[model samples]
Target: IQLWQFLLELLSDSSNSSCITWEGTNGEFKMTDPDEVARRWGERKSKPNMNYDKLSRALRYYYDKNIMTKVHGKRYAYKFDFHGIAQALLEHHHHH
Candidate 1:
């Protein structure tokens, strides 16, 4: 699963619109409550240990790959660029 897809689905739903929104600039998404977002994200993937700190670490990695970019001076913001979207549609981070 990809964060972008998950993020897209979240934004796609009006229910999450209050806490999740976008910048006037395209591809730039903003979240007023990162904890809520990370909380939900943690639940979604069954990662109870997930925290905004942990989620942000993953985000930073994504930034390196051009999957996302941190918006300067923003509390919790990132710009999405599907540079490797063709690949992001899947992945495997598992353990036996």
Candidate 2:
């Protein structure tokens, strides 16, 4: 599975809000702490070598897909395009 899709799932959980959340301004999403975000994602995917850099490499690839944007405002500053389409697919899967 693509990492962004997994991140979409993570956004579905309220508990992850402290570490990962959607910015109110736009469709952007920020990951504040790699502690839970990276660690949990590592175990979540069973990749013990998982680090923010490795995970970020995956995120960077999404730029090729145009599904992502890097604000470059500094660390953890990223945006999600096709937010509505994602919800559309998510809703479809929810009722599927």
Candidate 3:
């Protein structure tokens, strides 16, 4: 499954909002619970050993491909891209 799709799914779910939530603009988000996100991702990927280190590497790969960019100098690091479909997807998620 695509990472974006996974992110959308998580963001769209109100139950998971405590773990992650939209910044209310520009498709940005704060990872309130990085470990929880990583755990869910690990379950989805069927990798019990998954952690933020491995998950971050996967997200970093998208940076080189122009899919998403990371935000540095934060207590809880975040990544976002407001271009094209991501913008529309974020808007949709925000609405619901």
- What TM-score, computed on C-alpha atoms, does each candidate reach? 0.80, 0.76, 0.78
Question: What is candidate 2's lDDT per residue for 1-96, written digit by digit as tens?
Answer: 657777878877867888888776676788878567777788888898788888887778878766788878766868887864576678879999
The per-model lDDT (C-alpha) reads 0.79, 0.77, 0.76
Question: RMSD to the native, candidate 2?
Answer: 4.1
- Total clashing pairs for each candidate: 0, 0, 0
> Model 1, 1-96: lDDT tens per residue?
766778888877868977788776678889878888888898999988778898888889987676888889988888887555535544422321
Q: Lowest lDDT 10-mer window, candidate 2? A: 80-89
Of the two candidates 1 and 3, the one with more favorable lDDT, higher being better, is 1
Question: Could you tell me which 10 consecutive residues in candidate 3 have the lowest summed lDDT?
Answer: 75-84
The weakest ten consecutive residues by lDDT in model 1 span 87-96
Query: Candidate 1 at 93: error in angstroms?
Result: 20
Clashing pairs in 2: none
**Clash pairs for candidate 1:** none
Write down the RMSD of candidate 3 (Cα, Å).
Answer: 6.1
TM-score of 3: 0.78
| Candidate 3 per-residue lDDT over residues 4-93, each given as its tens digit | 678878988867888888766666777788888899999998998988788778878877655667767764555566574566667779
